[PDB]
Write a protein that binds this ligand. Structure first.
Ligand code: IFV
Ligand code: MG
Ligand code: ZN
Length: 313
């Protein structure tokens, strides 16, 4: 009840910044998350004993893959924390509650393969969910864990507040299907520029939350350069393993997943920053001015990748 979580001074200060790295001590990640819920939401959003039991079941259902692991989960939740704390009064009691959980749960039981690889392998998940395959599985795993005895952190909500919060978490998790990102942003650009964007329009919040979700999911590109660069090794470790598996089915993988095309990584990062991350953080800054630090840092890292190509590192 009167049980604040506190962090060492350096973590206490740095956690509030967009570029914060959660560090290499796994055992502090849960306490970092609870810290972030208590400051974001109030110390009374969730029964501490239920929250902790949920956090630990969530952790157990993330796998030891190089990128799409428990650390990615908490990184993506911290980005959302920084977005929520920098746009205090724009978000409902329920959105604050639901979006940090959506971020923690957004890649539950990921196997380190793309929606594409499930379909080409003919994985049962691909028969059961024809589009946003892994993303529907992720939401599906979230409801499973919420239904385990002692785990329902939403128990104090009304029947209707519950349905609202599970629907935010659903759309929020679906939104991290990057195939949907491109449409969603183009619509948000058009809407902001013609002046039609209305944050009381519930279909408009939906799109805006969808973009935050993409922005949090890609926050690897908004980190200090050594973090950005070492995270990229993990990303390519998954993608190249998928390319190996693609070749095993008798299929040329796309260049991004071919480990023979290591040499072209820097140029691949360029394409990705220009085609995906920069637009993402641009549109987000227009719509939510105080997120500008994610854009600035994204640009900085693009400039670091240009330096790599020019043999200056
Ligand atoms: C588009 N593309 N093409 C290539 N290659 C062609 C041949 C060499 C590389 N590499 C890429 C981007 C790879 C990437 N994906 C992600 C996903 C999420 C985040 Cl947070 C960062 N990244 N960085
Ligand atoms: Mg995902
Ligand atoms: Zn993710």
């Amino acid at each position: 009840g009167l049980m604040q979580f506190t962090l060492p001074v350096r973590l206490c200060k740095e956690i509030e910044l967009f570029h914060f790295d959660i560090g290499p001590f796994e055992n502090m990640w849960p306490g970092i998350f609870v810290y972030m819920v208590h400051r974001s939401c109030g110390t009374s959003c969730f029964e501490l004993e239920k929250l902790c039991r949920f956090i630990m079941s969530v952790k157990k259902n993330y796998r030891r893959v190089p990128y799409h692991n428990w650390k990615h989960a908490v990184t993506v939740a911290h980005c959302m924390y920084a977005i929520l704390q920098n746009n205090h009064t724009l978000f409902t009691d329920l959105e604050r509650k639901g979006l940090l959980i959506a971020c923690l749960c957004h890649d539950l039981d990921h196997r380190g393969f793309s929606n594409s690889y499930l379909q080409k392998f003919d994985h049962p998940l691909a028969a059961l969910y024809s589009t946003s395959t892994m993303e529907q599985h992720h939401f599906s795993q979230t409801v499973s864990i919420l239904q385990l005895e002692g785990h329902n952190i939403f128990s104090t909500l009304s029947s209707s507040e519950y349905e609202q919060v599970l629907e935010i978490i659903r759309k929020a998790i679906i939104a991290t299907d990057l195939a949907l990102y491109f449409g969603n942003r183009k619509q948000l650009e058009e809407m902001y520029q013609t002046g039609s964007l209305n944050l009381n329009n519930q279909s408009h919040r939906d799109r805006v939350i969808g973009l935050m979700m993409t922005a949090c999911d890609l926050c690897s590109v908004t980190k200090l350069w050594p973090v950005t660069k070492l995270t990229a090794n993990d990303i390519y470790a998954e993608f190249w393993a998928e390319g190996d598996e693609m070749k095993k089915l008798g299929i040329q993988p796309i260049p991004m997943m071919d480990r023979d095309k290591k040499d072209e990584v820097p140029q691949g990062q360029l394409g990705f920053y220009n085609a995906v991350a920069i637009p993402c953080y641009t549109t987000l800054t227009q719509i939510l001015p105080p997120t500008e630090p994610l854009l600035k840092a994204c640009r900085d890292n693009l400039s670091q990748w240009e330096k790599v190509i020019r043999g200056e590192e």
